[PDB]
Design an enzyme around this catalytic site. Sequence first.
Site, PDB file in Angstrom:
ATOM      1  N   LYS A  10       0.823  -1.210   0.000  1.00 36.91           N
ATOM      2  CA  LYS A  10       0.000   0.000   0.000  1.00 36.91           C
ATOM      3  C   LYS A  10       0.860   1.263   0.000  1.00 36.91           C
ATOM      4  CE  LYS A  10      -2.037   1.745   3.493  1.00 36.91           C
ATOM      5  NZ  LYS A  10      -1.202   2.922   3.785  1.00 36.91           N
ATOM      6  N   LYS A  15       7.725   1.031   0.310  1.00 37.39           N
ATOM      7  CA  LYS A  15       8.224   0.320  -0.867  1.00 37.39           C
ATOM      8  C   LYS A  15       9.512   0.929  -1.397  1.00 37.39           C
ATOM      9  CE  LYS A  15       4.431   0.854  -3.197  1.00 37.39           C
ATOM     10  NZ  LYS A  15       3.744   1.554  -2.079  1.00 37.39           N
ATOM     11  N   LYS A  41       3.866   8.362  -8.127  1.00 37.88           N
ATOM     12  CA  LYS A  41       4.628   9.308  -7.315  1.00 37.88           C
ATOM     13  C   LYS A  41       6.015   9.575  -7.906  1.00 37.88           C
ATOM     14  CE  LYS A  41       5.360  10.351  -2.373  1.00 37.88           C
ATOM     15  NZ  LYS A  41       6.705   9.871  -1.975  1.00 37.88           N
ATOM     16  N   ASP A 129      -2.290  -0.271  -4.054  1.00 37.80           N
ATOM     17  CA  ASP A 129      -3.564   0.002  -3.396  1.00 37.80           C
ATOM     18  C   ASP A 129      -4.736  -0.488  -4.228  1.00 37.80           C
ATOM     19  OD1 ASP A 129      -2.455   2.020  -1.266  1.00 37.80           O
ATOM     20  OD2 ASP A 129      -1.632   2.554  -3.225  1.00 37.80           O
TER      21      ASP A 129
END
EC number: 1.18.6.1
Lengths: 276, 276
Positions: A10, A15, A41, A129
């Site tokens: 998530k 990560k 991101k 997610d």
Amino acid sequence: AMRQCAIYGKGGIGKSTTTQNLVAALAEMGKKVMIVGCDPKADSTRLILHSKAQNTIMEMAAEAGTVEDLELEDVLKAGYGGVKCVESGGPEPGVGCAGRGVITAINFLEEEGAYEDDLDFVFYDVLGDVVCGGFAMPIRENKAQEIYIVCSGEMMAMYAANNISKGIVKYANSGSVRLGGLICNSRNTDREDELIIALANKLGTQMIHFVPRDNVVQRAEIRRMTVIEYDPKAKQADEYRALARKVVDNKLLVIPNPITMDELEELLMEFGIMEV
Amino acid sequence: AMRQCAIYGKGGIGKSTTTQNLVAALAEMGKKVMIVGCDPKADSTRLILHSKAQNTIMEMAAEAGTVEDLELEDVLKAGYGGVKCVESGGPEPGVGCAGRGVITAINFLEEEGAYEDDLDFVFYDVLGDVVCGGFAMPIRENKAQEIYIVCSGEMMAMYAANNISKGIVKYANSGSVRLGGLICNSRNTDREDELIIALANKLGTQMIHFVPRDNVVQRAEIRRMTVIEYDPKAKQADEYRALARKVVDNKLLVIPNPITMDELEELLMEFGIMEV
Ligand SMILES: Nc1ncnc2c1ncn2[C@@H]1O[C@H](COP(=O)(O)OP(=O)(O)O)[C@@H](O)[C@H]1O
Ligand SMILES: Nc1ncnc2c1ncn2[C@@H]1O[C@H](COP(=O)(O)OP(=O)(O)O)[C@@H](O)[C@H]1O
Ligand SMILES: [Mg+2]
Ligand SMILES: [Mg+2]
């Protein structure tokens, strides 16, 4: 031979910090590694590159004309330890499918020969997610044989691990995508290690490493570095080296057994996390 | 008149706990409210319904034949305070688009007359880690005029708030979707309230409430209740009542000004969150 691995989990679970530090430890051992950022991101390579982030394939293709106008040698960037880095990018919020850039990027890297014989590992850093569109592509299209899921004793992180596991099961009739392990990125809660070990056993995998919460991570990242580079003597550097060693040595790659929400809640109640 | 509101934010940030408690406080004041779950986790109504979760429109339609075979009176369920509840559902991981059920659900509710004249509020509880597909639909299709974003001093939570804000901007040329406020769901970190106030000011909105971290939430949720129902005297119950009052009274609904990652990082460095 090269091992194609993907790090799922998530958002905000760790990560990119875990991947970049793991990969820096692999490079420190002499392994040749490429990181492919598969999260909009798009900051999955900044600690290897000492950078703000990295310009994405989507951005570069738009400036060049088409993705086919790009040259691989202009796209891949090497940082700490010779680790090679690329970012997929993705459409802006509200436009399209957030995962579309992952598909474009992986196909470009394959077509252009990025998977050179001398690489030992490729790590995809993938948003987890939702398991759909380009975020599901590394599983659906057999791009990452070894999935490692970063999680914690947080209910949402364990739910995400279960959903990713369901995705692996869905595509198990072809290809060779398998669950390689859970990595617990600690929240400093009691019995969290036992909780993730128990979750891993229910899924049929293992907890490959418990990564402690350590503020040296923030100090290294303010300086755009992995802990491995920022302070090779740090306790946390040795943690990432232990994770890297166990990834190198891991031979357990399973078709997981996803659990029910009832089982997830029972795990939480058993290890007193919600009562801490 | 009814106010259509959506609660967005990254996974695990506190959307469903905050929404259900806010809505229970609204019902306690005498407001008529419906909650529409728009997150595949599909546990956005369990604390109102005293339940494990709620069967989803996708699941019910599959058993009935088609969604048009469903009767609204069989789908909506009322719990604490008369609050009406529905869950969208979504495809299994690895299958389709994770947000597809949101589109089906909202269209069904509209077609079947769920938006009855006597409702004062509708709250959509929406996954916010990606802003695409059915998760973008409440913004793209002008279903929720007032967006409230649950966030925290966590970089990822603030990034999500910015991405949702970019989605609002993208669709501002038609409809009337606006950013109504940030709700800080506390991580017990120093200056977190100041940080979220500062983020809100940069975006052009406000921090409508700072929700403390309080373990009474876990105690209530183990019993499938809002804090409002579980312990009406709890300090945290008064926190949710304060949030509800300020939502009722809020008149600031803006087209936000999304910020750069540079500005987000500067906010973090300024308020010493990464150095705590
Ligand atoms: N083991 C750890 N100890 C301390 N901070 C951590 C650790 N792992 C991650 N973090 C911090 O958590 C935040 C989110 O991590 P990141 O790897 O960016 O998450 P993701 O890539 O899953 O969204 C970052 O600020 C990172 O520095
Ligand atoms: N203010 C709070 N204090 C304590 N625990 C909280 C608070 N808000 C949320 N939680 C807990 O955080 C977890 C995630 O909240 P939830 O609302 O389910 O997140 P989301 O719906 O955004 O995924 C839940 O276990 C919930 O009980
Ligand atoms: Mg990341
Ligand atoms: Mg929720």
